[PDB]
Design an enzyme around this catalytic site. Sequence first.
Site, mmCIF file in Angstrom:
data_model
loop_
_atom_site.group_PDB
_atom_site.id
_atom_site.type_symbol
_atom_site.label_atom_id
_atom_site.label_comp_id
_atom_site.label_asym_id
_atom_site.label_seq_id
_atom_site.Cartn_x
_atom_site.Cartn_y
_atom_site.Cartn_z
ATOM 1 N N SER A 197 0.818 -1.213 0.000
ATOM 2 C CA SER A 197 0.000 0.000 0.000
ATOM 3 C C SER A 197 0.849 1.259 0.000
ATOM 4 O O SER A 197 2.041 1.224 0.354
ATOM 5 C CB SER A 197 -0.928 0.018 1.216
ATOM 6 N N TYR A 235 -4.333 11.899 -4.382
ATOM 7 C CA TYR A 235 -4.826 12.839 -3.384
ATOM 8 C C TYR A 235 -5.271 14.009 -4.269
ATOM 9 O O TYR A 235 -4.416 14.764 -4.734
ATOM 10 C CB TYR A 235 -3.675 13.326 -2.480
ATOM 11 N N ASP A 244 -10.101 9.225 2.777
ATOM 12 C CA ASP A 244 -10.103 9.296 4.232
ATOM 13 C C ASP A 244 -9.144 10.321 4.847
ATOM 14 O O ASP A 244 -8.912 10.306 6.060
ATOM 15 C CB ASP A 244 -9.871 7.896 4.838
ATOM 16 N N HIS A 285 -6.888 4.412 6.830
ATOM 17 C CA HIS A 285 -5.551 4.981 6.656
ATOM 18 C C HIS A 285 -4.493 4.428 7.608
ATOM 19 O O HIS A 285 -3.480 5.079 7.853
ATOM 20 C CB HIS A 285 -5.627 6.507 6.790
ATOM 21 N N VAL A 334 -2.453 -5.761 9.150
ATOM 22 C CA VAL A 334 -2.155 -7.103 8.632
ATOM 23 C C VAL A 334 -0.655 -7.403 8.779
ATOM 24 O O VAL A 334 0.173 -6.744 8.159
ATOM 25 C CB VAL A 334 -2.576 -7.235 7.144
HETATM 26 C C1 LIG Z 1 2.330 4.130 7.635
HETATM 27 C C2 LIG Z 1 1.847 5.061 6.562
HETATM 28 C C3 LIG Z 1 0.653 4.796 5.937
HETATM 29 C C4 LIG Z 1 0.218 5.618 4.923
HETATM 30 C C5 LIG Z 1 0.950 6.733 4.578
HETATM 31 C C6 LIG Z 1 2.185 6.957 5.135
HETATM 32 C C7 LIG Z 1 2.638 6.125 6.139
HETATM 33 C C8 LIG Z 1 4.025 6.368 6.701
HETATM 34 N N1 LIG Z 1 0.256 7.688 3.933
HETATM 35 S S1 LIG Z 1 0.188 9.424 4.573
HETATM 36 O O1 LIG Z 1 1.613 9.925 4.941
HETATM 37 O O2 LIG Z 1 -0.412 10.383 3.493
HETATM 38 O O3 LIG Z 1 -0.699 9.470 5.856
HETATM 39 C C9 LIG Z 1 -0.444 7.304 2.852
HETATM 40 C C10 LIG Z 1 -0.373 8.040 1.613
HETATM 41 O O4 LIG Z 1 0.508 8.805 1.201
HETATM 42 N N2 LIG Z 1 -1.536 7.818 0.858
HETATM 43 C C11 LIG Z 1 -2.571 6.876 1.130
HETATM 44 O O5 LIG Z 1 -3.615 6.793 0.504
HETATM 45 N N3 LIG Z 1 -2.326 6.035 2.183
HETATM 46 C C12 LIG Z 1 -1.283 6.205 3.081
HETATM 47 N N4 LIG Z 1 -0.980 5.446 4.204
HETATM 48 C C13 LIG Z 1 -1.855 4.509 4.549
HETATM 49 C C14 LIG Z 1 -1.598 3.260 3.744
HETATM 50 O O6 LIG Z 1 -2.078 3.438 2.392
HETATM 51 C C15 LIG Z 1 -2.229 2.085 4.461
HETATM 52 O O7 LIG Z 1 -3.637 2.361 4.620
HETATM 53 C C16 LIG Z 1 -1.618 1.839 5.818
HETATM 54 O O8 LIG Z 1 -0.204 1.905 5.922
HETATM 55 C C17 LIG Z 1 -2.074 0.492 6.153
HETATM 56 O O9 LIG Z 1 -1.876 0.273 7.513
HETATM 57 P P1 LIG Z 1 -0.694 -0.651 8.049
HETATM 58 O O10 LIG Z 1 0.506 0.190 7.866
HETATM 59 O O11 LIG Z 1 -1.147 -0.796 9.451
HETATM 60 O O12 LIG Z 1 -0.776 -1.893 7.217
#
Ligand SMILES: Cc1cc2c(cc1C)[n+](S(=O)(=O)[O-])c1c(=O)[nH]c(=O)nc-1n2C[C@H](O)[C@H](O)[C@H](O)COP(=O)(O)O
Lengths: 385, 385, 385, 385
Positions: C94, C153, C181, C247, C286
């Site tokens: 992801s 985004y 989200d 997220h 997961v």
């Molecule tokens: C840990 C993490 C997750 C991010 C992620 C960055 C990090 C460091 N980010 S965020 O900076 O904007 O919040 C994204 C991202 O770029 N875009 C997105 O759709 N999901 C983002 N996610 C969420 C990601 O797509 C998964 O939903 C999330 O990591 C799944 O949870 P686990 O890590 O617990 O498996």
Amino acid sequence: TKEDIARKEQLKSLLPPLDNIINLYDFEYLASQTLTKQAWAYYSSGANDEVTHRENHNAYHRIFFKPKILVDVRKVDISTDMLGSHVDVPFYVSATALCKLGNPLEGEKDVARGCGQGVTKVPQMISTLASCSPEEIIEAAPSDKQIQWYQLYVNSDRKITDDLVKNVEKLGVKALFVTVDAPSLGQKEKDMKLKFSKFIDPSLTWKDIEELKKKTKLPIVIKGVQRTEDVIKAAEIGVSGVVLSNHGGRQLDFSRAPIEVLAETMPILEQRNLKDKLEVFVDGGVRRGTDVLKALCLGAKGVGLGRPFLYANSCYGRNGVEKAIEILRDEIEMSMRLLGVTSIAELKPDLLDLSTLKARTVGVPNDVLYNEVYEGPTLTEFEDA
Amino acid sequence: TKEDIARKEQLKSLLPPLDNIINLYDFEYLASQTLTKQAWAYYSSGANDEVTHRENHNAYHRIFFKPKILVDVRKVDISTDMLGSHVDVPFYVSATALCKLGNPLEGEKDVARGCGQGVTKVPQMISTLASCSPEEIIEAAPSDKQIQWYQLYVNSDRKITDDLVKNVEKLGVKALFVTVDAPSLGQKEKDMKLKFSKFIDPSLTWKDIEELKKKTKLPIVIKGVQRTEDVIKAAEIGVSGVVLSNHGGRQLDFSRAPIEVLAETMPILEQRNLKDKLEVFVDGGVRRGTDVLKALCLGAKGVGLGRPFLYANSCYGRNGVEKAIEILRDEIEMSMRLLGVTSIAELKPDLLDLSTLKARTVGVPNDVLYNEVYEGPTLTEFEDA
Amino acid sequence: TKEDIARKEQLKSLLPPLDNIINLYDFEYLASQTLTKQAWAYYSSGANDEVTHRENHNAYHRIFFKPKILVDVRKVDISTDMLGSHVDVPFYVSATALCKLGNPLEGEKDVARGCGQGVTKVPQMISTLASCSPEEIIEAAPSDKQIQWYQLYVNSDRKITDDLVKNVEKLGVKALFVTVDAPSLGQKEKDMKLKFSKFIDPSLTWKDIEELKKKTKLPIVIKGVQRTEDVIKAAEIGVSGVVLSNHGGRQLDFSRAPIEVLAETMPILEQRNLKDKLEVFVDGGVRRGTDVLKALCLGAKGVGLGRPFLYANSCYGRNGVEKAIEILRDEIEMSMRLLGVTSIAELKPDLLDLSTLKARTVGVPNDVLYNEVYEGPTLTEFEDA
Amino acid sequence: TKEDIARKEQLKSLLPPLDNIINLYDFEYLASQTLTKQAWAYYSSGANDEVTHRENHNAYHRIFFKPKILVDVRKVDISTDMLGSHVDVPFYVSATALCKLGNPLEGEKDVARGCGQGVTKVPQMISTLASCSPEEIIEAAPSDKQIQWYQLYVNSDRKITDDLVKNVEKLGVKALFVTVDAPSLGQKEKDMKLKFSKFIDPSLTWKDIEELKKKTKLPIVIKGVQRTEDVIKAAEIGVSGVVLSNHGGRQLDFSRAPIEVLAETMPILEQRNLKDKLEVFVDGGVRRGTDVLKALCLGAKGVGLGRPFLYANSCYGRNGVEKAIEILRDEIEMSMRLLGVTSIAELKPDLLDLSTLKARTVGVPNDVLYNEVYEGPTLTEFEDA
Ligand SMILES: Cc1cc2c(cc1C)[n+](S(=O)(=O)[O-])c1c(=O)[nH]c(=O)nc-1n2C[C@H](O)[C@H](O)[C@H](O)COP(=O)(O)O
Ligand SMILES: Cc1cc2c(cc1C)[n+](S(=O)(=O)[O-])c1c(=O)[nH]c(=O)nc-1n2C[C@H](O)[C@H](O)[C@H](O)COP(=O)(O)O
Ligand SMILES: Cc1cc2c(cc1C)[n+](S(=O)(=O)[O-])c1c(=O)[nH]c(=O)nc-1n2C[C@H](O)[C@H](O)[C@H](O)COP(=O)(O)O
Ligand SMILES: Cc1cc2c(cc1C)[n+](S(=O)(=O)[O-])c1c(=O)[nH]c(=O)nc-1n2C[C@H](O)[C@H](O)[C@H](O)COP(=O)(O)O
């Protein structure tokens, strides 16, 4: 060991002033740090995994209150009646064998004294296996108004028990509590580890209780019932009462918490009228007035405590018992006011939230790796300089 | 490492007298501190997160008793029958590969000995992957009255397994337990971390069991069933019994606790008569007589333990196995008295409270900041001077 | 700080051999001890109390298996299809913004490499806020057979997003995952404490998705749905799929665990046929093949992981990602065999025990005094001399 | 003690910059480490076992959200109305006696100031037992737009209370919250241990409230209702509102969490129309915007916090109160965006998952021997050299 003198340091002078005792758990702590290893092991131990012992307490926490407000609670009365007599408090001191383990000098006599000396007088159930004789325990009683019941362990040699009943009946004890939950051992590993039953007839039957009724005028209470089916049987043979108990978790482990059985029983006894024909008592795991109030709300005639008064006496003797009595007495009063009732009779189940009474859970094993590696949030700390 | 000698210090002389062993958990402690890192890793490990391994135990705690009182329990009999033969105890020693990891000198022979030497004789299931030969394990048996069953892992090279069945059958083993829950690995990370299956045919089918029935007169028991649907299928192909098991949590993690499946299965087997036509055994997480009593109450023909006897043999050998046997035997007796039954047949579910049997919970994550900042109550301390 | 060099000690040479990595939690530990405070805070943090973040994992533990036995599981296939293309594994990497925080030199390029280099090829979702350009991430891909999806985004300045869609579509990304989200912040206090959104349009609407469909041929997946009602709405506007996600618990705290929503959703999508018309993905919490298997059993088309691959790359780069891939790949295979299925299609809910899926509990506060004063049982210790 | 100066070290200079305060738990930490033993004991203590005090919080965690996505949440409004007036925030600062214990110099005046100084203005409920006079607390208010309610403890000497009502009414307070949950003590053992009610009439009745309505034009709110039955009675006598509260767990222990009662009440008030005729407030255990959102979603008109603002004022005074206000205000806004609503009115229960609202559990006692002897998994460690 030489450490017995280390205890003499704690015990002597270092014990906090009896007034500085805020609750029943305080008596327990002091006791664990001053009582001899043999005494403590025997007093504090339960059978095997001590699950039921602890479960007896935990179950009270599955019941919450639904207190009434804007009710005049200036005046509050907690006196009630048990086995024919009138009692000042809705609780009593249950039978505990070998009180001299903790109180070498006076044993059960200080309990007898503590129970009937002060303003408030608590019924004291006397153990068949007490360290003192039934004569000296009944004589130690400082009040004609105080009640003393006798706990009976029928002997294999029924002749001995036959005489006992005669003697204590003559001595004036108000009732007979025959303990039915201890036919076998009930292994106390805490004690066993320290060392490194002819008196109790394993053949007692409902028929024997039927015959015990003929040999005595004293109200009979079968102490140690663990199922509604037997509460009903008690009523059938017509005994005076019953004590939903599991011996303080010193017998069968994985026996339900008495309060949990109480909640199941009463409604059945009510849908059969037996409610008034059988006095249901309940003990084990009761440490606060709120615990006593939940039992009383479900239907219990009186609630019994064993270890708290045992620890009180083993630390402060006669006076500790009185302090413990006052403590539990004040807790029942105050919480009653907060519930919006002014008498024990007004203590009904409608004042209870029993919706999570069966939320007796056992989660799935913890994920040690996931939670080990995980770092939790933190509070903003102070500046170093 | 040189620390193996640090273990020789513990092991030798420092081990407490076998009589000072109060329960099965004691054998485990001693073992964790004396067994070699490889042995301990292999004996104590489960698959992945060891959730099922632990869950197997936890599930027993979702069942409470409803003991009968005022019943003559002077005499109590725990002997029963399993796979045609009469057994002294309602439990048995389950198959555990490589016993020489913990008992280098005698391995399975000391288990064979410990099981049939004393007053009480326990059925010993013999592993296909045992450190000793089936000949020397069966010859080690000190009693003609003791029972020995054989655990079968069908080889990919069925010719090898065909011979095995012929040999152990000839050698006199009373039944065949063919293990169906280990077609694949079942990663033991504790062991893996230490290092830093052609014998088990991954193609076994119900058809194969149907053919195994023709090549043997011995009762066949499919060891490792994890769903009611397969218990039914077992009955359909007509095998002698089934063992509701998940390999002690050494295979699929998140497989239910066998006692939990037992409770689901039996009623279905009863609403189909299959109850008597299929002997349902159950193992995993059994450490106390009360555990064995709950399974027996639900309908299990016999209950099996693996690790406890494994740890006993790895610390005290043949005698440890007998001690463990006595221990579990005394626990089943005593608790039986307390339940109000005098025989294994009298052990029925009506003696069980299964109302919270499915309270398998997983709370929501702890609020680390709220509970971190919170300061809990305190017991009144002793005077300093 | 100077302690960055203390990390250089850990990181350099002291890191265990990539082969010595047993599971995904291992990558996490190593990462927490080597990544910079800013990186770790950003990677490991969730919103506020991090309850949902953790709850995402915990929920998987409310589901147990009902594995089939005596099934030929020699051969097992885990390849499946997602958004039109054929995938080797039922999981994917992801989107995670700023991979260069953990992998300063290659960032997302090593993820792109790790995903398509080895025997197994995992779809990689590319983040709008990645440290590298979409061009260099798509070019870094070592396989024509590997899939790369793009996480979108939508900008307040829709003109910028309009171009982005054109560019990544041209660059060949197989699909568009528009993250719904994250309209607002989602406070990461762990990071905030360290310092001591124009790019994301807070006005996105279903109408905008309806218009996004016209400006692209790429399959659209609304990433971040947290309720069945919106899964239905997605199907109504006719998008390609949906990702039940919150997220990774970095947004709204107290959002349900996606697996818990999945279990609620699918049956509704099935009682409306939408099942095949909408590809439901699911991510967050997961960490094991068994987690992936539960989601796949409930209906998920594919399961996504974020932090595990993120930590893998931040410690071992391209190779760590491959190791992580193998690890999760082997876990899905082995557990599949143990479940009694040989393909992803055979992964149905009938293989799941969802009876305690809602046992999301919050016990009543611990009785600190009762449990403080209580002394628990003990294991029989060794002889001193 | 001399350690008061050790606190002067913490307090003075060492306190982190008010901007470095991330949440309400931070105010609490700092406070526990700087407030005098008497102040902290009185502020942080609850009655007896502090179960209800803590349970008030825990209950919020039994409610999860079902947030809407793809909704324009650029603009979000959290202002609402309470007791006739318009409020900027859906929360308020509840009555807390003796604020000078924590803020010796200004006490309640700094709370008055902090509540009405900044951009955001919060309603301040003024305690009958405040350290400052009602005159100087109302005069301290920096805004004509800010609201100030008065908490009334009716005296036994009703003449004193009659005058009080006249005076505060004249002084301009917007409403009267008469506290009905403190007729008796409500033992704070933390405070008691430190020392080692004529003002509150224990005879208040619904009739008295009926008469209080005649002696005042001010909206009357019965603060401290703990059951649906009394909410109904309140509506019957026609008072302005009600506060589902248990005094922050400082009175009856084992009183349900107000949010739990809220969830039970509102639907009944709705199936009787009373919904609009009675303003239901709710307080206790609220530490986050998400907590306030759940209560608002269930139907609460406004949510109150006591200790958080108390700790804020006791550490940072007027400015701490504003910081706490901003903090809670920003948390309610952000989470609102994430839920998919733009106004307080849009906050409905349909945004809540109340399916595990009654998962108030009490597991069976831990098996100390089984879990003691058990060794859990481990993360792969770094190379030593
Ligand atoms: C840990 C993490 C997750 C991010 C992620 C960055 C990090 C460091 N980010 S965020 O900076 O904007 O919040 C994204 C991202 O770029 N875009 C997105 O759709 N999901 C983002 N996610 C969420 C990601 O797509 C998964 O939903 C999330 O990591 C799944 O949870 P686990 O890590 O617990 O498996
Ligand atoms: C702690 C304790 C309890 C004993 C007690 C002795 C001790 C030291 N014993 S025992 O040695 O035979 O097991 C008696 C006793 O003499 N006779 C009896 O009927 N109950 C006996 N009980 C049980 C008692 O009557 C109550 O059921 C028990 O103490 C209540 O549990 P709590 O202590 O948890 O309130
Ligand atoms: C602890 C243990 C268990 C083994 C066992 C070896 C060990 C060390 N093994 S194993 O090498 O293949 O994994 C066997 C075995 O030989 N064959 C078999 O059918 N069961 C085997 N079992 C499982 C055993 O038969 C019981 O199901 C298991 O031990 C029961 O769990 P408890 O130990 O928790 O009672
Ligand atoms: C913490 C605290 C609370 C007090 C409070 C004093 C303190 C220090 N007191 S008390 O001296 O009588 O116990 C008052 C008070 O003056 N009058 C009143 O109605 N509520 C009083 N409350 C209760 C208050 O109004 C809220 O119900 C309570 O603080 C809400 O709980 P949280 O602190 O958990 O939000």
